Amino acid sequence: WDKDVYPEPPSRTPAPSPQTSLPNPITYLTKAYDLVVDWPVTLVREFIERQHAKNRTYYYHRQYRRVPDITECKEGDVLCIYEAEMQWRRDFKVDQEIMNIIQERLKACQQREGENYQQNCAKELEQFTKVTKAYQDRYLDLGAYYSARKCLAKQKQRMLEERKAARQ
Amino acid sequence: MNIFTTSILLIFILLLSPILISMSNLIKHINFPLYTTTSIKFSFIISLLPLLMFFHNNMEYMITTWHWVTMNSMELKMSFKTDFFSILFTSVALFVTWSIMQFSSWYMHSDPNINRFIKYLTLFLITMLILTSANNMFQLFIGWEGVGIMSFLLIGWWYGRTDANTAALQAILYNRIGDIGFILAMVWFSLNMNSWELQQIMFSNNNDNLIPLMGLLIAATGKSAQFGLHPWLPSAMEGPTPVSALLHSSTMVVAGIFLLVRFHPLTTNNNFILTTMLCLGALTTLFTAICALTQNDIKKIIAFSTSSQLGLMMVTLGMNQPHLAFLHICTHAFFKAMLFMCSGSIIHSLADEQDIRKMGNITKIMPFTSSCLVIGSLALTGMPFLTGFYSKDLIIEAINTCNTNAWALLITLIATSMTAMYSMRIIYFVTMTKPRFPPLISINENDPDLMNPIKRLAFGSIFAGFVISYNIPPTSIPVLTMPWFLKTTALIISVLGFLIALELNNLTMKLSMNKANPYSSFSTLLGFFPSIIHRITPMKSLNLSLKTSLTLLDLIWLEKTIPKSTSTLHTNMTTLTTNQKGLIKLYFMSFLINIILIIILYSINL
Amino acid sequence: AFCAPPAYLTHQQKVLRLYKRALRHLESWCIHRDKYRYFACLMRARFEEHKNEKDMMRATQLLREAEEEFWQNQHPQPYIFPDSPGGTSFERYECYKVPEWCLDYWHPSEKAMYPDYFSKREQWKKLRMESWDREVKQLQEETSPDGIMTEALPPARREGDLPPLWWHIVTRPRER
Amino acid sequence: LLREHWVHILVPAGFVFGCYLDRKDDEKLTAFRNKSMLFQRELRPNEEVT
Amino acid sequence: DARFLRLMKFYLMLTGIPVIIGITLVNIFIGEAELAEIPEGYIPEHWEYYKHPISRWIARNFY
Amino acid sequence: MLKIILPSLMLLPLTWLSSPKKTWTNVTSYSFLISLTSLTLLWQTDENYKNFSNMFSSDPLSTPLIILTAWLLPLMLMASQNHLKKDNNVLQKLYISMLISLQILLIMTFSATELIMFYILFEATLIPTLIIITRWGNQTERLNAGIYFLFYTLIGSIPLLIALILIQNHVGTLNLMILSFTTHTLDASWSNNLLWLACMMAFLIKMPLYGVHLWLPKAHVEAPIAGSMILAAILLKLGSYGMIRISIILDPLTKYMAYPFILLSLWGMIMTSSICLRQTDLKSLIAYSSVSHMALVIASIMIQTPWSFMGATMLMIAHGLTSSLLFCLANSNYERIHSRTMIMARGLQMVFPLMATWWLMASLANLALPPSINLMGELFITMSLFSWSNFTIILMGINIIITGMYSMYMIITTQRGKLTNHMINLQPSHTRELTLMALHMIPLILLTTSPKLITGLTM
Amino acid sequence: QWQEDPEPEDENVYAKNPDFHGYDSDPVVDVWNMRAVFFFGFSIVLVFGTTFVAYVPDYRMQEWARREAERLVKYREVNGLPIMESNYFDPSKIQLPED
Ligand SMILES: CCCCCCCCCCCCCCCCCC(=O)OC[C@H](COP(=O)(O)OCCN)OC(=O)CCCCCCCCCCCCCCCCC
Numbered sequence A: 001w002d003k004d005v006y007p008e009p010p011s012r013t014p015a016p017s018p019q020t021s022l023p024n025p026i027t028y029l030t031k032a033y034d035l036v037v038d039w040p041v042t043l044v045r046e047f048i049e050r051q052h053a054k055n056r057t058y059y060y061h062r063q064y065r066r067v068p069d070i071t072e073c074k075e076g077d078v079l080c081i082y083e084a085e086m087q088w089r090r091d092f093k094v095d096q097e098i099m100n101i102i103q104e105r106l107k108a109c110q111q112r113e114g115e116n117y118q119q120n121c122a123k124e125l126e127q128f129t130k131v132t133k134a135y136q137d138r139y140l141d142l143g144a145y146y147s148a149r150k151c152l153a154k155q156k157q158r159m160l161e162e163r164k165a166a167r168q
Numbered sequence B: 001m002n003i004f005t006t007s008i009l010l011i012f013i014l015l016l017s018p019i020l021i022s023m024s025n026l027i028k029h030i031n032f033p034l035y036t037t038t039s040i041k042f043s044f045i046i047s048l049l050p051l052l053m054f055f056h057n058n059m060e061y062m063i064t065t066w067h068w069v070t071m072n073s074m075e076l077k078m079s080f081k082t083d084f085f086s087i088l089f090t091s092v093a094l095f096v097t098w099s100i101m102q103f104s105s106w107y108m109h110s111d112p113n114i115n116r117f118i119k120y121l122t123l124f125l126i127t128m129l130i131l132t133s134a135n136n137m138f139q140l141f142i143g144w145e146g147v148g149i150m151s152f153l154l155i156g157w158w159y160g161r162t163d164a165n166t167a168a169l170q171a172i173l174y175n176r177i178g179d180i181g182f183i184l185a186m187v188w189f190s191l192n193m194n195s196w197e198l199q200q201i202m203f204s205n206n207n208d209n210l211i212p213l214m215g216l217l218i219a220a221t222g223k224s225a226q227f228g229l230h231p232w233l234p235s236a237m238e239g240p241t242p243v244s245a246l247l248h249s250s251t252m253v254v255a256g257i258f259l260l261v262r263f264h265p266l267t268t269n270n271n272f273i274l275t276t277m278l279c280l281g282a283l284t285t286l287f288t289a290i291c292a293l294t295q296n297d298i299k300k301i302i303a304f305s306t307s308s309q310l311g312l313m314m315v316t317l318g319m320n321q322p323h324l325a326f327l328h329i330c331t332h333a334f335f336k337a338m339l340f341m342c343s344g345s346i347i348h349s350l351a352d353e354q355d356i357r358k359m360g361n362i363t364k365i366m367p368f369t370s371s372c373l374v375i376g377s378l379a380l381t382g383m384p385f386l387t388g389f390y391s392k393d394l395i396i397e398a399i400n401t402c403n404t405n406a407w408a409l410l411i412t413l414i415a416t417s418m419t420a421m422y423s424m425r426i427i428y429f430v431t432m433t434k435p436r437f438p439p440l441i442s443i444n445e446n447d448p449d450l451m452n453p454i455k456r457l458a459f460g461s462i463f464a465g466f467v468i469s470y471n472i473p474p475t476s477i478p479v480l481t482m483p484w485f486l487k488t489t490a491l492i493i494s495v496l497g498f499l500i501a502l503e504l505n506n507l508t509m510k511l512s513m514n515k516a517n518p519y520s521s522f523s524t525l526l527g528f529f530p531s532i533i534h535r536i537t538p539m540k541s542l543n544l545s546l547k548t549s550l551t552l553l554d555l556i557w558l559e560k561t562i563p564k565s566t567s568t569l570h571t572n573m574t575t576l577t578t579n580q581k582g583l584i585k586l587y588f589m590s591f592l593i594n595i596i597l598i599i600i601l602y603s604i605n606l
Numbered sequence C: 001a002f003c004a005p006p007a008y009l010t011h012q013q014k015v016l017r018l019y020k021r022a023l024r025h026l027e028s029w030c031i032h033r034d035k036y037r038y039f040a041c042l043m044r045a046r047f048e049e050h051k052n053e054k055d056m057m058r059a060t061q062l063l064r065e066a067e068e069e070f071w072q073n074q075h076p077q078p079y080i081f082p083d084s085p086g087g088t089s090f091e092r093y094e095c096y097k098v099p100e101w102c103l104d105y106w107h108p109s110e111k112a113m114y115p116d117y118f119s120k121r122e123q124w125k126k127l128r129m130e131s132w133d134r135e136v137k138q139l140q141e142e143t144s145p146d147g148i149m150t151e152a153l154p155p156a157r158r159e160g161d162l163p164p165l166w167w168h169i170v171t172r173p174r175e176r
Numbered sequence D: 001l002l003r004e005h006w007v008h009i010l011v012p013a014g015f016v017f018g019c020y021l022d023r024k025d026d027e028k029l030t031a032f033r034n035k036s037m038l039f040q041r042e043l044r045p046n047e048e049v050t
Numbered sequence E: 001d002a003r004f005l006r007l008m009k010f011y012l013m014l015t016g017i018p019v020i021i022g023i024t025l026v027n028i029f030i031g032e033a034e035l036a037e038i039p040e041g042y043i044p045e046h047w048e049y050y051k052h053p054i055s056r057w058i059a060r061n062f063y
Numbered sequence F: 001m002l003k004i005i006l007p008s009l010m011l012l013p014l015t016w017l018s019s020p021k022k023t024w025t026n027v028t029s030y031s032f033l034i035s036l037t038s039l040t041l042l043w044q045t046d047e048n049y050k051n052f053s054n055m056f057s058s059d060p061l062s063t064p065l066i067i068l069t070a071w072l073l074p075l076m077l078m079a080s081q082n083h084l085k086k087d088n089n090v091l092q093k094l095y096i097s098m099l100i101s102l103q104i105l106l107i108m109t110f111s112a113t114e115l116i117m118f119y120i121l122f123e124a125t126l127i128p129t130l131i132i133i134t135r136w137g138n139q140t141e142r143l144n145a146g147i148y149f150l151f152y153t154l155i156g157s158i159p160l161l162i163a164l165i166l167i168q169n170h171v172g173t174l175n176l177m178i179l180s181f182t183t184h185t186l187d188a189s190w191s192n193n194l195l196w197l198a199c200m201m202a203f204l205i206k207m208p209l210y211g212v213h214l215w216l217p218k219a220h221v222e223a224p225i226a227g228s229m230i231l232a233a234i235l236l237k238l239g240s241y242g243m244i245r246i247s248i249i250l251d252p253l254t255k256y257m258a259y260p261f262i263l264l265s266l267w268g269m270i271m272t273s274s275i276c277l278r279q280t281d282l283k284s285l286i287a288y289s290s291v292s293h294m295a296l297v298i299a300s301i302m303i304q305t306p307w308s309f310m311g312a313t314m315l316m317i318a319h320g321l322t323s324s325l326l327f328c329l330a331n332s333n334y335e336r337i338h339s340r341t342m343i344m345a346r347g348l349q350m351v352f353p354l355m356a357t358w359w360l361m362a363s364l365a366n367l368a369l370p371p372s373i374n375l376m377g378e379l380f381i382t383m384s385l386f387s388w389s390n391f392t393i394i395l396m397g398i399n400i401i402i403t404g405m406y407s408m409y410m411i412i413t414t415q416r417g418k419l420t421n422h423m424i425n426l427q428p429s430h431t432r433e434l435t436l437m438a439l440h441m442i443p444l445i446l447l448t449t450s451p452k453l454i455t456g457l458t459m
Numbered sequence G: 001q002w003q004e005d006p007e008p009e010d011e012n013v014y015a016k017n018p019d020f021h022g023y024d025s026d027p028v029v030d031v032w033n034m035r036a037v038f039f040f041g042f043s044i045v046l047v048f049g050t051t052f053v054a055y056v057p058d059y060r061m062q063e064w065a066r067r068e069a070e071r072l073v074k075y076r077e078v079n080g081l082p083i084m085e086s087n088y089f090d091p092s093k094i095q096l097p098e099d
């Protein structure tokens, strides 16, 4: 859990001000819980972490060298097109996960703010709209048989119109 | 954040446990009813705590428990949204199902599959808790259909009765008609928001969102009972009184209203949805109460009254009072369950008769259920403080204090009077007249499994409105400024209904024959909605299915065209070419024609 | 549920059944016993007023008119006793009305309990493979050769013979 | 006993024959063993990658 | 029918209970692995890229 | 793959030189072991696909079909066992060999890379099915049923072959993923439209379109239970696999040369779900159910969206399992009553109180009770078609209603009335058939718990 | 009429094998067949199949993808870059046709 990826803003919790003389069950109930649920489960997780610590193991995040793109890939040579298409699928999946991260970042803010989500949950909504625009420009109307070549055709069918707009 | 979530999931673990013992071999060596009842009891005691912590802090939580799938930028997971609605409805429904399980262990003795009955009850309870605590439309749909199928399995308990099955299939049909709109809404949201979670969906407050709301409104008309899809609820009385009390007085029918309150952040800005609510819910308060004025069955009367109250809650939803609608949902269960409870007590005491025209003097031959029935009837009518007031008074004040439709504003109150009318009917024909029931008498209501549940639900029906209304937060400002003829209208009109009913019922005496009339015939035969719809629509659908598709298209024309035509063509050409007689003269003349044709082809094309 | 209708109901039967239905609907309409008795006596007077009449045509006419009056003045939600058609218990225990042959498939370790029961069930068969052949002859021999026939059945005229076609009227399950 | 229990040597023998033929197939197709623009390694810990 | 149910439960437990015991003891004693950067020199294996001991064991030994 | 095919080839000698008492047992056990070994294909740790040879290959779409094929085998063995019980040892060995040959050819044609190998196997699937249906049926119209099946298939398959040759000539290969990395757009000319028609009609027949559905109900009603099962589960899927594989090169024609089939599917859905209300034969009812479900698959392949293909795959597998289950359930009764008429036997759930559950759950699935993969497919097909055009939801809802109607009709006219007490021949439920139903259900629970193995290519 | 055998008659099996199981008349064979079925389909395939399938790691990279997406979001939000652009391919290396 990297708090930069997942912000989780801080918590302004106030002081309990018991302006009365009648007790509060919740407090003694929480104490009883701490004593009869937390303590033993904590000890057990400590034991398990002990076994872990004494027989640790490490695993690495696989890196992927960059290969040529479709642009430098001839019109019928498949040894290159395979590499390029695999790379494109890889980046497509990573972009799926990026968008899912943004959405998981927006739901939390909505739930947190509550009735103030229309005023305090705006930069997240803006990031969402932006990444949505990007995902749409990259992958919206490709189809079930999507591929780097169709993405490239989309890019060019967009850029020619943008060029017309630029010149006039 | 450890105690809250643990207490939220512990009730599910508990409710599940019985069904785990239902697959084990301990059933035949355990008292499954008592064990399940104790499980429900402890589940209620557990659910009581989150309620305290909320009433204190007013904090809601979202709890994602397990990752199910990841579909290309669309996750799906088990997500519980613990809020006011969920945490209060859970406690109410558990506190009720406790009483119902006890009364069921009493009422269903001599049934060998009482274990199966209890299992099905707890399964429905689990489905409803899913529906109620879902933070996701797919989970909510799971609960939806689980309720809809538990209804089929419980209405049908007596699978030899050829009418309980008709009722079950009726419910299935109407609820699928509602599922149509539910799925429409799910589709609209999945496309235009790439999500199914309340959180993201709440960012459509500026969008148009009229089609999904129409879909949800259809789904609510379906799961609840409104003039278009109502009849399946009365026909649900074909099942035992415990399920009539749980699935058809307190749960499985407030599901659409719960849907609409959950989606109130989007109905706040659509004066076409709020206006068809206000003009539909009121159309049921009147049309069912009318039906509840000339029926002779306690169960049908109670069901029509339930439908009327549901129309009232839809009315207060349309008038933009979702919290009030939910408060009514929660304060209605107590007495609309205790009423079915006393009904079933009276019935099992007698020889399985529900027709009020053959019972009387209950006020004296059965004090306990008579007292509890009177308490429930008063709470339903609106007696100033018996769990009816704290919701109905505010509803009937807002109804006239808001800018509304001036015909709904009238028929709503006419039905609010018909409430007291048919309640007085119950009271007078079941608890005030002479004993027109058979002569043999084996009454016995001295069993704790029957006395304690009703005592409990009655304490509820008396004090729940106080206990809640004085702890919940003020999510809406009411109008305590109005004339007396608006501040006292509900009470006054309930009293007038009681008096009119007294008069018209004492007229039942006086040796004046009862000349049938079309008004009463209409109210008795349900406005003929069933008697005509359930006869035309099947006939058309089925005569089409048979004479058109199966007969005309499949077994006739799609055969005549493709295969039969192929066979005919090839058999005919076969006959042509094999009609040959062994004549060398003819074979050689043909060879000569061939030679000529070939020579000509060559000499021509060249 | 024990006999069969005759090829045609007679005027007497028609009138009796009309009287019964009229009285049941009078009960439905009038909820109190005093009222019911009052108007039942009135109706029986209306009936007896035409008991010593014999003109069959005028009788059939009076009946055809009374049936229309009934259809016009009938309660649409009459009282039906629970265990009867239209009642809230009609065909309710058919789920538990399991037949007898369902025990021929039981497993030895199931009839090992109730052994005294299954011994009787056995000799109840011995009482059936013997009492079968003579139940046919009693029908063959008691046949109307003039073609006429109806759904009646005779008893047995001997000491030892049993009523023909009994196994299913006997042996049927309780109602409960 | 064999005349009735020797038929248990066929299907596992078939599984092993299949694994062997897969081994032959991948002993073929050896080209590009380390000439992929993505997995070009340097053969430091060993002499054959695949 | 009770026979079929009993036998189904017996033959599922017979090989699920020991499996479950093994999985529990594994996840207690051994435990999942931990994300670690790659030493600039070491060439990881096709199994040191996974997390669960059973996963990387099956990989190392059969794939 | 060869580790899956060689043992399936060895199941034959085992069958023939096994003693007349242990052949069933041994072949069933080893078939189960084959089903087990087939799970190697699920070791997909990357988005790269498997390629064991120039002749074989596996994908997230062919793996589930293959595993369902290897799983259905021992179930068909167990189900074809009570009948042909008196039949001679040689005849029943023939039956087993037919089943095994179907298994092998289906595995091959799901693991194939070349369209023409796919073709020869998708057309060799006829011999064993025809032989099973004609040599072990009980009626006298099984001959006409085999005629219909065989010749519908071949008439649809010839132009497909011709199109494959035309391609193999224009391009130099029929190899998949090369036909992908080299595909070109087309000219939208009539020749290419007819190429589309040719490539498609074979599969649109093998999975019954509305108008050419007149071989499935026959074959089912007249065929034994193993034939019914395989026909409902896999032979209806060969077309879907073939179209999902061949639609990649026909771009951009299916944008406008697909409307008629979308229309026919969305309408025949209703017009068969309705027959499921007024058919008397339980087997024909379930056949028309299969048709109404394959209509969705067709209409979802036609529109070419990821959600659409996902739903297509999910519903393919789910319907396979559920239809096999329902067919075996009806067979359990047929074996006891020798009549496919539904309203004849009633009031069960009294003497068969457990099989009434299997009857119920197979119905809860067919009517798409959540959480279930039937629904996880129907829902996404509905969403895809709603994005296509919002007016499809009307027909989708109508079909949903009719499904919820006829499923419960099938339930109630068999298990939820009062008994036909005159039925002395109701031999209690066999452990064998209870095990059949359990083996059908449990995998649905597991695939509902882990539906990541069932989405398909896109996901 | 013509020569042919008469239709046979139904045959209860439990009468002789009340411990019947469904597979064969021979009781020992019936029992061993049901045992093989239950031990190869339930006790092994479903159990070990479920186990293996559940412990298949990183099915189709859905986990590595999330990890790498977290890495990318960090990198970009840290260096001020945007989280995703509107053009996959850099429009420099591309060479558009001039009308
Ligand atoms: C009961 C039903 C009736 C049963 C009897 C069937 C009678 C057969 C019909 C008579 C013969 C007419 C067909 C003649 C084929 C003409 C050639 C042709 O259409 O091929 C064109 C196309 C390739 O053209 P292209 O690649 O663009 O360039 C030029 C060629 N290098 O390549 C193609 O398009 C291949 C076309 C093959 C023929 C397709 C036939 C129609 C396909 C749709 C219906 C299929 C169902 C069976 C036929 C029904 C009746 C047509």
Ligand SMILES: CCCCCCCCCCCCCCCCCC(=O)OC[C@H](COP(=O)(O)OCCN)OC(=O)CCCCCCCCCCCCCCCCC
Binding pocket: B067, B068, B069, F035, F063, F064, F067, F068, F071, F317, F361, F364, F365, F369, F370, F371, F372, F443, F444, F445, F446, F447, F448, F449, F450, F452, F453, F454, G045, G046, G049, G050, G051, G053, G054, G055
């Ligand atoms: C793909 C081929 C298709 C062919 C089908 C034929 C298959 C025959 C071969 C036998 C089956 C082989 C294995 C089948 C798949 C097993 C999947 C599995 O192992 O479960 C994995 C699951 C954890 O999933 P994992 O991917 O590791 O983590 C991410 C979250 N899924 O861990 C688990 O959940 C395992 C624990 C199981 C507990 C089951 C509890 C049941 C809960 C009730 C759910 C009810 C839902 C359905 C209700 C309506 C249905 C009508």
